[PDB]
Design a protein around this ligand. Structure first.
Ligand SMILES: CC(C)(COP(=O)(O)OP(=O)(O)OC[C@H]1O[C@@H](n2cnc3c(N)ncnc32)[C@H](O)[C@@H]1OP(=O)(O)O)[C@@H](O)C(=O)NCCC(=O)NCCS
Ligand SMILES: CC(C)(COP(=O)(O)OP(=O)(O)OC[C@H]1O[C@@H](n2cnc3c(N)ncnc32)[C@H](O)[C@@H]1OP(=O)(O)O)[C@@H](O)C(=O)NCCC(=O)NCCS
Lengths: 133, 120
């Protein structure tokens, strides 16, 4: 049995500013929120305790009013290096997040989550250097 | 006379949830706002944020906008977030004017620009 931490929610009025699409930084709000949710449930509760060092975000598909989406969390690497996917109801990959944190027994919860997470092909968004072609 | 598009702001408690420091996503909110403000007086495809020095309650910071590159239809921005002394606190490079580019001061791009996320 392979496992995937998941958070589903819907695009609300708060998340939209102009021309009926989810505002760019609100994606980041969501990604952060879901990342805390993963650490809150993996040994580092606010009552138990991490600093965000770095993050990359790609926006691939527009998100409209009422649109329900899912954020799925993968461990790409650790010593920790995360990769989160934001997918539509169709399964359409709508956004990506790549994110690095560090500290200021969780090593077990994250180890067994990594050991028990499914194998996917990492999309081209992972470690894609930003440039104009 | 070379110019720079700039927004100065103070860290409020609205920007703090835990660890007595500015929440990571609020940086993105600030950056996106400053970009929008630039395009108003002149979609986001892609973006990269680095957090190099934590922001505390009462810190007066400045966000400064540079154009790293531009094309017929794309803008490649690089934005710096610095404390009141000059300390580089955070960076934001973003893929989404000609005369802003021509009249902006030539700087040495910090190593954050085009950096690839990895554990060393
Ligand atoms: C805009 C959108 C419909 C793309 O449709 P499109 O106009 O047909 O463009 P396509 O990507 O299909 O076509 C490929 C072109 O886009 C360019 N492009 C796509 N992604 C790029 C990136 N990260 N950097 C640079 N160029 C990019 C390709 O290089 C190519 O350019 P070319 O014309 O020089 O060959 C889609 O990307 C989108 O809706 N994204 C969501 C944006 C968003 O919601 N952001 C958050 C809130 S603003
Ligand atoms: C502790 C703090 C000062 C980090 O800087 P520092 O302690 O001076 O750390 P150093 O530069 O000496 O490097 C520490 C290690 O981090 C590693 N590291 C630093 N940045 C990294 C990155 N972006 N990706 C991967 N690894 C990184 C370095 O390789 C270094 O390796 P080592 O421990 O093997 O020596 C931290 O308080 C900070 O940077 N604050 C900003 C974070 C913040 O406010 N976040 C936003 C909200 S969560």
């Amino acid at each position: 049995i392979k496992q995937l931490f998941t958070h589903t929610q819907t695009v609300t009025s708060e998340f939209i500013d102009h021309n009926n699409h989810m505002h760019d930084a609100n994606y980041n709000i969501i990604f952060s929120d879901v990342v805390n949710r993963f650490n809150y449930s993996h040994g580092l509760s606010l009552k138990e305790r991490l600093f965000t060092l770095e993050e990359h975000t790609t926006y691939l598909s527009e998100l409209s009013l009422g649109d329900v989406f899912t954020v799925t969390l993968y461990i790409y690497d650790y010593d920790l290096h995360l990769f989160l996917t934001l997918t539509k109801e169709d399964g359409t990959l709508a956004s990506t997040n790549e994110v690095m944190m560090m500290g200021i027994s969780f090593s077990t919860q994250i180890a067994h989550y990594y050991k028990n997470q499914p194998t996917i092909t990492w999309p081209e968004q992972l470690g894609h250097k930003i440039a104009i072609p």
